[PDB]
UniProtKB/Swiss-Prot annotation, chain A:
Superkingdom, natural source: Bacteria
Protein name: Flagellar hook protein FlgE
Record localization: Bacterial flagellum basal body
Stated family: Belongs to the flagella basal body rod proteins family.
Span within the parent record: 2 to 52 of 403
Gene from which the chain derives: flgE
Species assigned in the record: Salmonella typhimurium (strain LT2 / SGSC1412 / ATCC 700720)
Amino acid sequence: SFSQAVSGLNAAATNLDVIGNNIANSATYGFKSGTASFADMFAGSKVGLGV
Amino acid sequence: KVAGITQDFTDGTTTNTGRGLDVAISQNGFFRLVDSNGSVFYSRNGQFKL
């Protein structure tokens, strides 16, 4: 369906906002890098639901 | 007719991230986690915190 695709389409934007923040802060003196971590979703059925 | 939606349990590639508490099994095996209620689960994603 559309929801399974839009979940991945939405998850692939936080994983660019985080990289853009890291690129911008790569000049400072005490910055710590940030990363994101994803997990899948599963309801009572066997077909998945996305990210 | 659909007889079933079922998995494929092969192994993908391996990406060295260079952190400390990150394990990756190379073959058959599962890490055994225990829930708050006392249930037991078996997983393969191996990124841990402390």
